[PDB]
Amino acid sequence: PQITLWKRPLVTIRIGGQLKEALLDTGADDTVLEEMNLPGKWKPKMIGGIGGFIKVRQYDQIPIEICGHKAIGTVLVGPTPVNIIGRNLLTQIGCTLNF
Amino acid sequence: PQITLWKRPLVTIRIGGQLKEALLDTGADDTVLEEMNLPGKWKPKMIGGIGGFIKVRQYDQIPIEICGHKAIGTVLVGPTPVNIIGRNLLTQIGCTLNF
Numbered sequence: 001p002q003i004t005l006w007k008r009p010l011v012t013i014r015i016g017g018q019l020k021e022a023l024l025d026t027g028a029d030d031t032v033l034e035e036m037n038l039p040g041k042w043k044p045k046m047i048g049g050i051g052g053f054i055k056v057r058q059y060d061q062i063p064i065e066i067c068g069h070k071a072i073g074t075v076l077v078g079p080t081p082v083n084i085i086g087r088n089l090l091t092q093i094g095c096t097l098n099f
Numbered sequence: 100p101q102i103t104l105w106k107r108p109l110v111t112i113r114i115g116g117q118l119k120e121a122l123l124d125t126g127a128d129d130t131v132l133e134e135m136n137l138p139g140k141w142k143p144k145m146i147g148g149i150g151g152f153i154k155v156r157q158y159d160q161i162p163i164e165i166c167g168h169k170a171i172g173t174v175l176v177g178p179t180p181v182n183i184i185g186r187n188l189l190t191q192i193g194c195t196l197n198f
């Protein structure tokens with residue numbers, strides 16, 4: 001697909017039994033999802049953006065489906081106001097910026 | 100150009116005769132630059148990111164050349180962690196997401 005940027009690039013993602021709307025975000029190194037209780041090991045981390053930092057839980061090798069494209073990798077979970085698909089997963093689904 | 104996402108999509112911009120590195124940020128509605136001097140009236144604004152809210156100065160109708168593509172639009176100036184080029188100017192240069 002081609003997604004223009006007139007509006008926020010929100011797409012449907014699936015993580016296990018949860019479907020959520022998330023930004024395809026080229027300005028995000030990492031994938032940051034709003035609070036959810038995923039299974040398995042994790043590690044605490046702090047990530048910074050506009051306004052300062054938030055504490056997140058880093059889960060590794062989590063499969064996520066993005067517009068029917070399979071991805072698997074690190075997902076950060078924390079008190080973000082929006083779900084953010086970062087470059088770690090954007091590359092896996094073949095996402096580029098073009099102009 | 101086509102830009103892949105294994106590295107941060109950092110590009111050189113020209114603004115007020117100055118060259119700066121800025122991040123092409125599809126997860127950003129607006130363009131937000133680190134502290135700098137721009138001429139003309141500005142208005143105080145507050146914006147919220149992942150870590151909370153900050154105060155910025157809003158300048159309207161500012162020319163920026165992004166990889167040689169001309170834009171003229173609103174630039175917010177304040178304590179962003181990184182210079183970010185948001186959708187207001189990404190649209191002007193014809194930028195889309197493709198996968």
Ligand SMILES: CC(C)CN(C[C@@H](O)[C@H](Cc1ccccc1)NC(=O)[C@@H]1CN(c2ccccc2C(F)(F)F)C(=O)O1)S(=O)(=O)c1ccc2ncsc2c1
Pocket residue numbers: 025027028029030031032047048049050081082084086122124125126127128129146147148149150180181183
């Ligand atoms: C700042 C940038 C270098 C990094 N961020 C990614 C951005 O795309 C971020 C993603 C993002 C989007 C929305 C909320 C929070 C975070 N966008 C924004 O902060 C700004 C806020 N804003 C926004 C939002 C609502 C109203 C007005 C604005 C305004 F437009 F502001 F008026 C908006 O439209 O973009 S991030 O979310 O902090 C981030 C993500 C992953 C990540 N991984 C490691 S550090 C790290 C940091």
